[PDB]
Amino acid sequence: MQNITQSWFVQGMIKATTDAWLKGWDERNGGNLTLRLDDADIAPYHDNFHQQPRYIPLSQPMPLLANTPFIVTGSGKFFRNVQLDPAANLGIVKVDSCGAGYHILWGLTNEAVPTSELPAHFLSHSERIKATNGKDRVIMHCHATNLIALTYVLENDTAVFTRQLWEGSTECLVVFPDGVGILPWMVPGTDAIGQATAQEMQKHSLVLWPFHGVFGSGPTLDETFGLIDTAEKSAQVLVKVYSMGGMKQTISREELIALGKRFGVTPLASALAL
Amino acid sequence: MQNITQSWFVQGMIKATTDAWLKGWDERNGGNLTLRLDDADIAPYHDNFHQQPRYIPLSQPMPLLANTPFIVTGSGKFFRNVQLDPAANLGIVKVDSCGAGYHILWGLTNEAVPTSELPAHFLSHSERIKATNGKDRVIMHCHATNLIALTYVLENDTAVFTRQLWEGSTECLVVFPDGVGILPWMVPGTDAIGQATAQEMQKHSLVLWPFHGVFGSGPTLDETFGLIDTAEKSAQVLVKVYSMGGMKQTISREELIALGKRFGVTPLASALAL
Amino acid sequence: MQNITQSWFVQGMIKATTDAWLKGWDERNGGNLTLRLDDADIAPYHDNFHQQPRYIPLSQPMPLLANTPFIVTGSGKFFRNVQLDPAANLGIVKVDSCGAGYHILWGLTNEAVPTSELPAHFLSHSERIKATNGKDRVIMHCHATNLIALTYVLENDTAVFTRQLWEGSTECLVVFPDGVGILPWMVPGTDAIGQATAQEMQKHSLVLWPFHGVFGSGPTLDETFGLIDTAEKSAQVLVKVYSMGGMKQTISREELIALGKRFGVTPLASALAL
Amino acid sequence: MQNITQSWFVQGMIKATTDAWLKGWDERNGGNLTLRLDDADIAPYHDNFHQQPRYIPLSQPMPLLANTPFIVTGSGKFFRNVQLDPAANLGIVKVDSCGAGYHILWGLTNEAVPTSELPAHFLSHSERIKATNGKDRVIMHCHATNLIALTYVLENDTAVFTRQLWEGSTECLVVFPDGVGILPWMVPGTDAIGQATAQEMQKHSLVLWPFHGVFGSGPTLDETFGLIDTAEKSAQVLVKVYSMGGMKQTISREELIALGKRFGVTPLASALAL
């Protein structure tokens, strides 16, 4: 019967991994993707399930994520190599009925462990479910060169950055009216990074990691890739003008106000007040 | 019989979207593209025609487009996904004999609707017919990377912008001798922007939307592609030259008239005299 | 028997135009390509030859190229379309035994004509056989993006321009030890500019045109592409470096002398004296 | 029997070189790749071995690489065509019993020879085996674009350059804590450049040739490609911020000191002082 790699939820993971590499966003093993799935999706594909689901004790249980299957990227794997050997780089995990751990059901072969950012992803996955009534399903991270470069020249404050990104295009304010988040620089690989990212998920859908990358949340794989792309497209325009001599004329504050009402969105009060 | 998807116009528009996709111009679902057809071009392919054509009334009467078939893209549809599904991403419509509505004949399945900028495309489609006596058949809009960044630095006046583009490459004066028209910033998706965009199309083949994108028209699918491609390359050279520190020697006014004299093209007097 | 499109030269021509389109030097219809053949090469493919060889006179006599066959690129064609229709974009011609005209034996279908730069392509062919004893066979023209931006800031002279290119990278001096020649601004498409280009071909294998493009020649297509490819890469570094604040350290004059002695090359006296 | 062209180490070569021509690194003939193999790897492919192995003496005796076969890329070959014909561009060699020369067993047809930087390969291959107890198996050289331009503006120091390369991205410190070697400008293709390059390999896994390129060494093909590309991404990040007017905030030393010991990594003490 049809291979599990030929299903919709694996083909989608293939495209987002390949296309984010050609753009130059996924040097080495940077970049991790986690997508929440449903039970009916994996029901007909019990044939390819492994005989022994390994058990890994999860650090601190999330009760809301009990009995929830997932798809994850293998830690240390390469995004470009996903299209070659999907089985060795992608795996499916499921959390037990109590929520204290997860069982690896398929993939992650050769004793491969899930991604090292699994804490931050799962803690932030739960919050987005309640904030938008369970519509968010994807958390993304990548090394976007232009957004990273802008962190070295501009202050890492949400209010200042939000106005700049909105000023770099017209579609931008429609895309992230809630604004973009930013942390202070923090050492990754720990559980402290999971809390600050999940805490910022409440008010924002994009949060920028200083000197590492960005984090974006969205319902589908396609829109999540397009969501980070839109801000990255505006990032390229901003960097060009700054090196060209400086910004001269732009969108007025009155012009930005008219945009919000026409499309029926509410711009951030903090950013628009600037 | 051979499917309509294997005809010349369906395959032709598949090329136009994919080529612009890799350029970095049409991320997410921005940009639009329409092409005018003939009754004879679609006569033998009535098999794929919808049994019941849905009816949608036009916002404002368009007498000049009565009983004319077009091919358009769908709203909220990415330019990447078209080659994966020609039927679910394109559509062919035929304006009624009165100029108030149109019927969807083929494509645009799953309650698909044409782009939200359809009034702007139909308004410019009609007015370019008067200027070119039916030669022009394509209207294209896309966010050219280097043209967007130029409006932040150069003044939004026809005389200044036209001369700078003529000096970034020798062939520019031959490709668009009429110059480029500049509009003031407006809220997209309304009807006010459609009337001003068509107003500049009477004397220009290239119209610039500040901070949003560019508009261009061409006789065929390939000529309109080169027109934007030629203008984009000129702006790319100007970006590096201006960013490198300044511009020291140039093509003089005496050389500009001599170049246009050989090829039989009349430059814009207001910008030439600058 | 395999048709002429399966010959070794036709397959080679597709490789050159296809890769130049991905590099970004042939927007719209810029660039031309011509290749020199031998009467023994086209012997087995006499069946494909047209029954009506169209005769076109030469602008000026070229006695040296008597009875010489060439394969050229048609005028007004897109380099991206060459890989799709070799017959309508390419063709073969043979110069008559007197040196005043040629006969179109295949290709250039539907009243297509060779490139308008043929007077420049043929005049430079003659002056390179004398300076190379019948070794060079290929002439290429392209609008190198990084080279055009250089002519707006650098002094338009043969000495300093050649010297600057030598410092871009180590291999630049070895590939073209004779330097490049740069003309004053002239209107393209005229015989007055072909003679100046052919005059500079006597001393150099690389020719520069301010604000327009580049000219190059080589033994075969792979060696001709490498000559232009190496030249543009050196320009890419300079534009990137110049915008950073100008050059600070570079290769000394004596250091290039040591490099020249090792590889048995004679650097240009004018440039090395700078 | 499966052809030699389908072997794992042959398919490794086709993947690594093709991924370098698409990144704009290997214009013309620049670049070469040598990978260490075992006798078991070449055992099943005895049928395709040449019956008359030509003997070529080595410049200097290499006892530490005795009886060790290698796969090499030919001299003067083009990285674009390797995928088109691996046999004519790739080759296999084996060191004799006394370590005085090598034999050609397969490939390198038509009097082809291994890359002219072969003495620079074996002098560094032998030393890297000692430092890492034989883990290293790949040597990579390529002309990265953004990397070269850094040498024209930054001081050519091992500690200073490594310090800057650490601040460009958070992953750079962990990937190469050992730093990157730097050398004075010297004439390639000589045994003197082989000694200096191999001499610095005792303390660093990467060496930078001013105005020329980079030298790579790692355990396998996949990591070796990502070993240099991590520095390439930091250079692209560095290049953009430099043209913006400088870098304003970054990772501080107090942030860097705690980063390594989180991963239990020993940083380069010389760069830590600055």
Ligand SMILES: O=C(O)[C@H]1O[C@@H]2O[C@H]3[C@H](O)[C@@H](O)[C@@H](O[C@H]4[C@H](O)[C@@H](O)[C@@H](O[C@H]5[C@H](O)[C@@H](O)[C@@H](O[C@H]6[C@H](O)[C@@H](O)[C@@H](O[C@H]7[C@H](O)[C@@H](O)[C@@H](O[C@H]8[C@H](O)[C@@H](O)[C@@H](O[C@H]1[C@H](O)[C@H]2O)O[C@@H]8CO)O[C@@H]7CO)O[C@@H]6C(=O)O)O[C@@H]5CO)O[C@@H]4CO)O[C@@H]3CO
């Ligand atoms: O010494 C010689 O170079 C030659 O020098 C003197 O010639 C000068 C002319 O008097 C002067 O007007 C001018 O010539 C220009 C001419 O007026 C223009 O029209 C044009 O010429 C083109 C010509 O119209 C056109 O048909 C074609 O010419 C070809 C010709 O039709 C064809 O038959 C062949 O010519 C051969 C010729 O038939 C042979 O007899 C022989 O020619 C001898 C010639 O008989 C000798 O007297 C001697 O010519 C003197 C001439 O007498 C002076 O007045 O030497 C010639 C060479 O041995 O060989 C010819 C070659 O096979 O081919 C012709 C061509 O080569 O294709 O094309 C013409 C060019 O476009 O332009 C000319 C030049 O500007 O300048 C002359 C030079 O000072």
Ligand SMILES: [Zn+2]
């Ligand atoms: Zn738009």
Ligand SMILES: [Zn+2]
């Ligand atoms: Zn040209």
Ligand SMILES: [Zn+2]
């Ligand atoms: Zn090199």
